Structures are given as C-alpha cells and as structure tokens.
Symmetry: C2
Subunit: 204 residues, 2 copies
C-alpha cells in the first residue's frame, strides 16, 4: 500500500450503533486529508445469469438509510438493476489506506429527486448526457459530438433526458476497512435484518 | 474528475484484436505516468442469491488470457467464486482519468503457482496470512496479533497456509474507458465470441 496518512479509526474500538454515522465521519476526514475523489464508487450489478458487471459511479448524495447515485435507466447497470436490485460498491482511498464496502438493494427514486439532482449539475454537463444513449453501441463518434455541440449552443440548463434517474442503495450490510498495524487489518462489519443493525469484527 | 494527466487513448482509433495487448500497454503507461496503485482491482463476486459483494484485491500477475490475484479460498470472495466463477473487476486511475472493466470467470491455479507466488512475497507478509482466517469473525484481536507475532519468530519464508490460492480471471469481455474530450468518453468494449475477440465502441 502507498498511504502516508495513518487514519484514525476510533470507531474500531468504539463502534457507533448506525453505520451511516461512521460513513459520515470517514467522508468528513477524507475531505480534510485531501483524498482524491473519495466519492468514486466501484459499483457492481448482476445480470440475469448471475454474472456481475462493474464501473465507477459517483456518490451524489448521502440519505438516512443509504447512498444515492445518478445514471441512465437503460445503461447496462440500469438494465441489470431493473431485474436484480442487489448491488455492492466499494470506495478505496489510497492516501489513507481505507476501504468502505456498501451492499444493499438499489431502487429508483422519484422523478422529482432526479430533476432536482440533474439541475444541480453544472449545465455544461447536460449536452452529452442528453445526446448520448449511455452504453449503446456508438456507430458514429462525429454524429454524437455534433449533437452535443448543438445542444451546448443553448448556453444554459437543458431538460432532464428520458431515462436519467437516481438510484438509492439502501444498506443491508457495510464494511469499514482500515490498514491497522502489523498487517492486522481492522474490519468492522455491520449487518441488517428485520431485527435491525448489529456489528462484528472480521479477520483480515 | 481530478485528472492531473491528459492521457491519450492511442488504441481507440485502430484497436488491437486482442484486449490483453491493450491491457498490457495501459498498465505500462500507468506506471510511467506515476498512477498510484494502478493494480488495485475492485473485484465483484456473487453469492447464491445473486447478490454481489465487492472489495479491493491486487492484480498479482498478468496471465495469457486474464489477470491473476491471490486470496484465501474460504474468504467470502473465495466461497462465492467456488459456487459461481463469474466475476468482474474495475481498475480506476484518477490521475489519467481511465478505467478498465474486466469481466470473466475466475478459476483457481495449481498449488505450484500459488506456492511460487506466496514465496515471492516479502516475508513479513507471511505471519498474518497464516494466523488469520480471512473474513471469519475476529474473536480477539490481541490473540490473533500474538499468534502472528509468534509465527514471525521464524525467519521466513514460511510455508503457504491451506487455502492460500491464486485465481486467474479469464476474460470474456473487457472495457477500456478514457475521458476523451468534451465529455465524449472513449469506450472500447471487447467480447469473446466464436473465433475469439470482437470489439465495438460504446456511447458515454
Ligand atoms: C470518475 C468517474 C465517475 C463516473 N460517474 C458516473 C456516474 O455517477 N453516473 C454514471 O452513470 N456514470 C458514471 N461514470 C461512467 C461509468 O463509469 C460508465 O462508463 C457508465 O455509467 C456506463 O456504465 P454501464 O455500461 O456499466 O452501465 C463515471 C466514470 C468515471 C471514470
Ligand atoms: C489496496 C488493498 C489491496 C488488497 N489486496 C488483497 C489481495 O490481493 N488479496 C486478498 O485476499 N485481500 C486483499 N485485500 C483485502 C481485501 O479488500 C479484503 O478485505 C479481504 O480479501 C476479504 O475480502 P472478502 O471478505 O470480501 O472475501 C486488499 C485490501 C486493500 C485495501
């Protein structure tokens, strides 16, 4: 590992009852430490044959019960999630040698949430998001580029495109992982059932 | 995107026929760019309920047809792979704004390969990999720490522990993603077919 910052993990010896509280604390410190792109989540979805796929998406919002991300409903992750809502993401912060694993069911939020989040983006991002049909075959790159440039001509916000949506990943289990000392990595694992949240430690 | 390096995607316009050639190119360039931990793979595996789980593992070797990583057979990932070999991993390189998605089936290599790999590791790594039962519940961190300290009393190399193994993820489809210009991300997607590999471009 290449981290130079021994990150406090005071939640290891004393675990909060709710994993959302550790997730907030950790993101707050990542911010202080200048962690480069701490919300880049490596997100796994699963196809109808039990075969996973992965890509980076950004955690756009923290909710009470989960993390939210924006994407296109008809992308590959969107098509997978429509038949199998179970997902898992991992964040890995090289600077502080920390990993966070988030497992749960990701479900599509109301249109209004999507409209709000869409319109929160810098309007410069809207052209390609409308022009591209995410994850479909690109037959002509120049055609796509021209469509987006014509859209960029408006020089302001564009309407949310059909299929632009938000999913919320409702947490069913979470692991917080810290480097520890002597390779004894520190693994704090939380789990949920209709009984609620419990935690335990895992061996590295 | 905090991408401090504008990275060309030389293969995008006229791609090689086999994706492993691109992977090797991309990994070699990543090292020369100074990408930090370019082999930290966010690896997804899938339980018997179709629910994915993720974590980081390091690509220990490039095989002829895939990527090799070391782990423990009775870890969560290893229990999951034993019942469903289909797996997916993403590399994300913040500095050059590149991602590589690797999809395939992961199969365990012979003991000889795992022994060689195990023996190539810095010997300080041996104690904990033997003393810990990866991803089992940790009963008592002091006791685990004592056992690894005890093992370390021997000058390594120490013997490979039962269950320490290498998996090779044999590629079935690969995506190379680059940031491109004007948000028109450059996605090159390879799929293993009849007579071997084909590729196409995907929309961002
Ligand atoms: C740093 C970074 C952030 C990204 N964030 C998102 C995002 O939040 N939402 C999104 O749909 N795609 C995002 N992408 C693009 C995805 O990685 C992927 O290319 C696209 O969603 C299509 O994924 P799919 O074909 O597996 O569904 C991001 C890519 C990078 C490298
Ligand atoms: C950057 C880094 C590299 C890692 N490399 C490996 C590795 O190569 N093999 C391994 O078994 N665990 C590796 N780990 C630990 C894994 O993330 C994980 O905690 C462990 O394998 C148990 O995963 P599981 O419970 O999901 O099976 C690495 C962790 C970090 C953060």
């Amino acid at each position: 590992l290449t981290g130079t910052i021994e990150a406090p993990f005071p939640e290891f010896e004393a675990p909060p009852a709710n994993p959302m509280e550790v997730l907030r604390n950790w993101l707050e410190r990542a911010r202080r430490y200048g962690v480069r792109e701490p919300r880049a989540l490596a997100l796994a979805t699963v196809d109808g044959q039990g075969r996973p796929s992965t890509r980076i998406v950004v955690i756009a919002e923290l909710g009470e019960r989960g993390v939210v991300f924006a994407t296109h409903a008809d992308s590959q992750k969107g098509r997978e999630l429509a038949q199998n809502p179970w997902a898992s993401g991992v964040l890995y912060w090289r600077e502080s040698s920390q990993q966070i694993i988030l497992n749960g069911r990701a479900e599509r939020l109301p249109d209004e949430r999507a409209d709000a989040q869409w319109l929160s983006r810098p309007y410069q991002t809207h052209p390609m998001s409308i022009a591209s049909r995410q994850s479909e075959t690109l037959a002509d790159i120049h055609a796509l580029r021209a469509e987006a440039r014509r859209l960029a001509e408006t020089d302001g916000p564009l309407p949310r495109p059909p299929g632009y949506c938000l999913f919320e990943l409702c947490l069913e289990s979470v692991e917080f992982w810290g480097n520890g000392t002597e390779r004894l990595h520190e693994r704090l694992r939380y789990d949920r059932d209709e009984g609620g949240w419990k935690h335990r430690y895992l061996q590295p």
